[PDB]
Structure 1
Amino acid sequence: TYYPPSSFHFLVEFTGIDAKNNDHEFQSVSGLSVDIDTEEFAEGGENRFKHKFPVKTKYPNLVLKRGVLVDSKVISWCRDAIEDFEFKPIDLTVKLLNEEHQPLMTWNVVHAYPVKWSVEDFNAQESKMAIESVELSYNYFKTIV
């Protein structure tokens, strides 16, 4: 913009999981990008370049981090998939906020489910917070702005 916005003020909301204020707060969000797979072809007589063709649109997994929370609803949902193969996809909204705490821009993440859950190593000789990490697979996203 004339002065572009910073990246440290944002909100993560879930649809299909009971809401709690402690499940909307995260330390970091990553994975909001996309790419197109292509193929190459050489045409006889054309020596200046090879041709390139698109094939598929590709998205990476969405990664969320925060300090450990013991009564999380999101984690209970993750456990049902992890332990029993019960899968029930959800939708999600990522919001980048302005100074009035209203959205500048949002991302609509469609049909997501859990593929990973972990907690970082313990160390008796270091002063650190216990950090939790969750990774989700989804089909695509759209933006609103």
Structure 2
Amino acid sequence: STSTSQIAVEYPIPVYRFIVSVGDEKIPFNSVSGLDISYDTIEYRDGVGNWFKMPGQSQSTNITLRKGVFPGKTELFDWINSIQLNQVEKKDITISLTNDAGTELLMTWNVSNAFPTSLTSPSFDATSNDIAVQEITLMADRVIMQAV
């Protein structure tokens, strides 16, 4: 006999309900991938036997967002088309696990200074029953995870 407010505190969070917000816009995405912290390890070892292991230089964060093609809207493409030589508008991406008809966040990830590389066009295919989907890849720094 678990109460419905006990499940909100004790139970794990399902992945499939999430909100992605790219800068000021919020746009519906099919899937989000990557988005993990990582560290190189530095190892010193000298002759008397002691072995030092340290966290080292952080690694660059690479995120992949996947989204279907909608008939009026290309604003994933216009972001990657605006790249002149090294100047692009970087913007913050927030992923947020929500409840059904999300008025309440459960977890929140924050990405800083994300800019697009490698927008992937759909694979046109005459014998396929799929939607035209696009992956955009983002390079960024500082994934942080926020409670609620």
Taking a change above 3 Å as real, the CA distance of residues 3 and 129 of structure 1, as seen in their structure-2 partners, is same
Q: Which of 22, 26, 31 is 2:29 aligned to?
A: 26
In structure 1, stretches of 5+ residues that fail to align are: none
- The offset of 1:98, in angstroms, is 2.3
Q: 2:33 & 2:127 partners in 1: Cα distance?
A: 30
Partner of 2:82: helix, strand, or coil? helix
**Could you tell me which amino acid in structure 2 is paired with residue 67 of structure 1?**
G
Measured in 1, the distance between the counterparts of 2:138 and 2:41 equals 25
1:76 aligns with 2:78: yes
Deviation at 1:28, TM superposition (A): 0.3
1:122 matched residue in structure 2: 124
- Asked whether the 8 Å contact 1:33–1:59 carries over to 2, the reply is no
Q: Offset at 1:126?
A: 2.4
Partner of 2:105: 103
Structure 2 alignment gaps of length 5 or more? 1-8
Distance 1:134 1:75 in 2: 9
Q: Secondary structure at the match of 1:95?
A: strand
Q: CA deviation at 1:96?
A: 0.7
- Relative to structure 1, the CA distance from residue 124 to residue 99 in structure 2 (aligned partners, 3 Å threshold; closer, same or farther) is closer
Provide, for residues 15-36 of structure 1, a one-character-per-residue CA deviation record: whole Å limited to 9, x for no partner: 25xx4xxx61111001121111
TM-score by length of 1: 0.82
Residues 61, 143 of structure 2: 8 Å contact kept: no
CA spacing shift, 1:127–1:6, aligned 2, 3 Å: same
Aligned residue number for residue 3 of structure 2: none
2:5 — aligned with what?
A: none
Name the structure 1 match of 2:134: 132
Q: Aligned partner of 1:64: which letter?
A: L
Deviation, structure 1 residue 120: 3.2
Moved over 6 A (4+): none
Q: Shift in Å at residue 127 of structure 1?
A: 2.1
TM-score by length of 2: 0.80
Query: What is the distance in 1 between the residues matched to 2:146 and 2:139?
Result: 21
Identity percentage over the alignment?
Answer: 27
